[PDB]
Design a protein around this ligand. Sequence first.
Ligand code: HEM
Ligand code: HEM
Ligand code: HEM
Ligand code: HEM
Ligand SMILES: [K+]
Ligand SMILES: [K+]
Ligand SMILES: [K+]
Lengths: 156, 156, 156, 156, 156, 156, 156, 156
Amino acid sequence: MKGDKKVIQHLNKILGNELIAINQYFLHSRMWNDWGLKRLGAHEYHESIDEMKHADKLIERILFLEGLPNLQDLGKLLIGANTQEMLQCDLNLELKATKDLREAIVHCEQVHDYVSRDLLKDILESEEEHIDYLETQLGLIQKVGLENYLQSHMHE
Amino acid sequence: MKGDKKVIQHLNKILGNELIAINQYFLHSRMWNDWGLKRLGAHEYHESIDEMKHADKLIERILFLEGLPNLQDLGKLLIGANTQEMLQCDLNLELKATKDLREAIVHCEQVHDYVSRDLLKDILESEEEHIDYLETQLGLIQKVGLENYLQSHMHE
Amino acid sequence: MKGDKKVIQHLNKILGNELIAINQYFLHSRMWNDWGLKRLGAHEYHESIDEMKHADKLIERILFLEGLPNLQDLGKLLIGANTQEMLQCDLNLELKATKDLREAIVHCEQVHDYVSRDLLKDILESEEEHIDYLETQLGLIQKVGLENYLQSHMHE
Amino acid sequence: MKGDKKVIQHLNKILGNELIAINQYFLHSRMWNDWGLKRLGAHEYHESIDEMKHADKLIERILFLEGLPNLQDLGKLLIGANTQEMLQCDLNLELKATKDLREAIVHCEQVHDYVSRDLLKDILESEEEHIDYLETQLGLIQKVGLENYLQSHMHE
Amino acid sequence: MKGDKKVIQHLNKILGNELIAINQYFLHSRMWNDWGLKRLGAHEYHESIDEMKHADKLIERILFLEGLPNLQDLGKLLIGANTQEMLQCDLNLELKATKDLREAIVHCEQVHDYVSRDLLKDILESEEEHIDYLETQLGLIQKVGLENYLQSHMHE
Amino acid sequence: MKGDKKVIQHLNKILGNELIAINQYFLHSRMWNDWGLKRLGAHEYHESIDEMKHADKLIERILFLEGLPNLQDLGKLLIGANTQEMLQCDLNLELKATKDLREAIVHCEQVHDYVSRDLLKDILESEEEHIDYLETQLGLIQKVGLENYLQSHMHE
Amino acid sequence: MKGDKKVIQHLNKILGNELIAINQYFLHSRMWNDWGLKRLGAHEYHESIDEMKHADKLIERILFLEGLPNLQDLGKLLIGANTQEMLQCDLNLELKATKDLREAIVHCEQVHDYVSRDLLKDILESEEEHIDYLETQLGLIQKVGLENYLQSHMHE
Amino acid sequence: MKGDKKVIQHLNKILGNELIAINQYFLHSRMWNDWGLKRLGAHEYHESIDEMKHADKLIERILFLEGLPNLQDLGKLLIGANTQEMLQCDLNLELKATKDLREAIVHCEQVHDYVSRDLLKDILESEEEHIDYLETQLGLIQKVGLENYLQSHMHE
Ligand code: HEM
Ligand code: HEM
Ligand code: HEM
Ligand code: HEM
Ligand SMILES: [K+]
Ligand SMILES: [K+]
Ligand SMILES: [K+]
């Protein structure tokens, strides 16, 4: 079913974002495991699977709309070098992502692609939850102290 | 455990190849699903996942060796336009990946990184099993014909 | 809860389309069975139950809004004479139904009937999935040939 | 994630409506239980639980958006003295609650808080379902007569 | 038990033929698996096992009759170039085998070795069941075409 | 994958050795059953099966490398006439076979066919385990006496 | 099976390193248990089991190659006086040990003792995994603080 | 608990005997497995585990009494070259171990360390159970003959 050209562009933009987040979060997860923060490495691993699942849904939507999913153009990974910076890097990406989700939803609505809007809104709900997690983690570092924070994520 | 700088470099080259394969195969899977060749899309999906797992091990070995895993630099996806092209592209990708795996194993031997060698060999075994799959599909397209081959991959 | 008059007109329009589809898809199903294409007959039967359930949800919503559901007016069925026409006729019908759905959703948002919009959106998502199936089937008749496509749909 | 000040004002306005509904439906339930109308009691109890669960989701969402949920300001409970009064009071409350949900959804949409909109639309759907229930009971009273309607709600 | 010298000789010829069949059918099996015709691969494998169990029974009997089993002399494998010739090569071999089997049986009856005879008839029956399978496949290639026959044996 | 001609010749040589072992162990197995040493017949039968499984793995590899497995050329069986000779015969062959296995691994490294090397190393470990069993069996005959060694192998 | 003199020399060297780790890690385990750091004691107890199983494999290999395992000679145990020093001592011992495994693997390849090489590579992998653990723990002691690190290992 | 200094010397002397017994019985065990006398090898393996378990109890006690357990000094293993010599080496070793245990118990009593005394008495009881096994095996060799004796420990 031929979709709106700019909807497909918006979708391919969100996909771009999901593709960065997949790589960024898989690396942070394997970093945290390598440092012995097993509980963070495991949580971050599932945040990366979630983004893979969003990508799958966006790729399927684009092919159905007779577009070309663009898995080639990979933007800037935000790699942290310590725990707080990695969580902050995850948050700065998710916030870039949700800005682009709002603009894409705005446009689906103008062109009446109500199903693409519903799909993006479900991704946006997932991303807002992840923002809530990340912001909470940066909160706890402050409330229990960095040493305690890292101590609480050594084991599962 | 600080490892050979060039072993890490080899590991990241193998990692870069895996990241292409992941995207290229995942894209091909969802194209075969879009066209209703669901037996092909399922099988290509699991090739995409197998490369996802090799990437996981490579990343873990790189971080253990105190290298920095490179997930930023995505090489060239080989995206086909029809079933015979998509299979042939995957095969070309796989043949380049096995050239690189062999060179990396040769280097692991020289510097005595026998465990990295063993990982790369397990991946190499897997990449050769995929090449057997691919060569065999292209062979079947000639033995039964393209129409019959697509027919047989319509349903699971 | 007295609903908006034009919303009720729009829901009755959608309902009229659903009623056509019910009958068109059920006849096509039964013709496919009569011809020995049982995979098609079975698939299309479920396609028409799904329309039946959509019509249930529209009938309930119209009565809740204190309108009178119109099951008396039945528009033109698009009945095909062979598997390729029958598939294309189904698609032509779904394409007219998504146009009406989008127009009914537009009005629902104008008058803040956000619950009716969400019901229509869920129907629209269903309709598009059907469109995906039909386009794909027609695409397969081209890729594998009609004789092979029909053969693949003789047996369950 | 700092949300929009008027979004939070609206959410808290929706929250305050739930907080009335909880108290009002919970008292009416205990009144019907006290009178021996156990089926009305048990059903109204579950309507209070439903509003309690809506209030939780609002509270959760207001805090994520970094506002302060307002559980201090309690508006006018509409307590009835007999079944007909109480059903009508419940229905007047829910008709107020839906007017306020529509105004807030209009505002979430204007600022692109699409997640807050979906949350409010989900509550809106539950409230309309309660309105069907209420209008229907008041309709049954006229059809079967007050003394028969009460009879049918004595037992569970 | 000291057996007849020419019975042992006949037995050891029958064993020679089983040994060709074992290797020939196993290589055809793995050949069909290399080509992706897993249904012929699976079936021809079980024919190889079946000839293995016959060879077992002939060795036990030869030794009980106090002769030396001959596993050293291996006749000519007829290895086929494609699916059709592999089936015809198996059939050629089985037809030679049935002939030796009937001479062996004739002689067994002459010297009153009725138990050897009964073992040989049991093998002969299995050989004729296999000849039926072989003739039947070759007929299916003429009836449905080579492309269709091969397609039907891609998937198990 | 066209493999190295010399690798394919090495594999075909290792296959020839396994083909000899299959027949040799199978005959020794069935002689020990004819003589009442069931525990030896049972153990040796499984040595025959394990060689058959090596044979299988090599055929699949040779075909994958686009060579032609040689099942036609059957070297000299070393059949013994009494228990100690049969054991010593089995041992002579396994020592011949490990030597060839080592020569082919050497050549698989020189040409970077690490997967083939891995398969041959697995076979080699198994053939070394058979050598331990054989040396040990012969050593036990020295320690307990041949009468006692055969007695200990009458029953399972 | 008479093995190479220098391979047996190398193998007895690995065993002697295993016997040191066995005792060192057991003692450290019982020290952590005595101080009430039961989680460290349990894990250290299991690393000591791990070295006990490698020693078993080395002993069995040496004896198969008709060497004499040397369980008499016992090198310097590196015993720490506190958690940080005990982990560092384990790490220094594991680093001496992987050096000797590498030299041993080198010599195994020279004389074509491919089975011994594969057993030592298996050990080498286990040692590296254990090295990753030790470095990770020292890193955590830095990043969470010693008191917090110890606290996390009081209980199981 | 500041333990008596001579108790702790005694305890480390019994520990040093245990450490010899561990390595000696383990070595004999793998020697008997390698010769195919699997029953002796299994029984000797468990004798080694039991001494490992005594050693662990001693280490804990020494640490409790605030001694430094001594795993560095390893005395003279008694390794035989055949079964009877091995059995008699174990018996010589156990006979030295129980003389040291009796001496350590005496001193424990004289200083009122009744808990250490009890631990030692339980080890002694087990050492006397091993002496009973050993003496009985040597007597069996005399009664049934070494050839029969060894025959009876060939299999499990
Ligand atoms: C650096 C790149 C990637 C890495 C390291 C990676 C890693 C993984 C891993 C480890 C798994 C779990 C497999 C298993 O244990 O069975 C997985 C699953 C999966 N991956 Fe990836 N992946 C990557 C990229 C992608 C991409 C590009 C996509 C799709 C566009 C994707 C889609 C999926 C999906 C759908 C699953 C299944 C998860 C589920 O349904 O539970 N991944 N990936
Ligand atoms: C206004 C028109 C119709 C409505 C609202 C309607 C509604 C429904 C619903 C809700 C179901 C049950 C779905 C479920 O399993 O949840 C159903 C079942 C079914 N309908 Fe319809 N339907 C309509 C017209 C038709 C027509 C025209 C036909 C055939 C010519 C038909 C044939 C069937 C059949 C065979 C079933 C299966 C029921 C069973 O086996 O239990 N329906 N319908
Ligand atoms: C090319 C030479 C041969 C090959 C490649 C081969 C292969 C095999 C394989 C793969 C199996 C199955 C093992 C499993 O269960 O995974 C098997 C079983 C067996 N083989 Fe062979 N074989 C060969 C020659 C022989 C010969 C010469 C004999 C006897 C004279 C024989 C007798 C048997 C028997 C009795 C079984 C057990 C069958 C059953 O009951 O399942 N094989 N063989
Ligand atoms: C040459 C030296 C040693 C060797 C070859 C050895 C070998 C083994 C083996 C193979 C096991 C069985 C573990 C399993 O398979 O799960 C074991 C268990 C064990 N070892 Fe040792 N070990 C040695 C020295 C020691 C020492 C010196 C100690 C104590 C100071 C010790 C303490 C233990 C304990 C407590 C167990 C568990 C026993 C049980 O409950 O089963 N080992 N050992
Ligand atoms: K066909
Ligand atoms: K703490
Ligand atoms: K005896």
